[PDB]
């Protein structure tokens, strides 16, 4: 059952580390890309995607853009982009960590 890539972003939340929560879906599995203030985001140990383990009877995937120690330079606009052959989606939010 093929279907379009989809995304949802939630308000940034502090859970010891900081997390921009997200869910994605799609079949086939989508390509993901983050933007920060409109620039393609290059993940490092200070800002990386972390997924929850997938549930067995599901294609939906959940996770965080995770920031273990954000600073003022991490404040701004975050966009998540998802694509597969049957659709393409984008979501953005503002995050203030300081």
């Amino acid at each position: 059952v093929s279907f379009p890539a989809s995304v949802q972003l939630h308000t940034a939340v502090e859970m010891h580390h900081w997390c921009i929560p997200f869910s994605v879906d799609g079949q086939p599995a989508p390509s993901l890309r983050w933007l920060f203030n409109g620039s393609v985001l290059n993940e490092t140990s200070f800002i990386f995607t972390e997924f929850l383990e997938p549930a067995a009877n599901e294609t939906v995937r959940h996770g965080c853009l995770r920031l273990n120690q954000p600073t003022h330079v991490n404040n701004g606009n975050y966009t998540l982009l998802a694509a597969n052959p049957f659709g393409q989606a984008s979501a953005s939010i503002m995050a203030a960590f300081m």
Partner: peptide, 14 residues
């Protein structure tokens, strides 16, 4: 792309 997942995550790629 992904810092944690150089080979994707269950088919999801960066």
């Amino acid at each position: 792309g992904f810092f944690l997942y150089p080979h994707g995550f269950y088919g999801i790629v960066c």
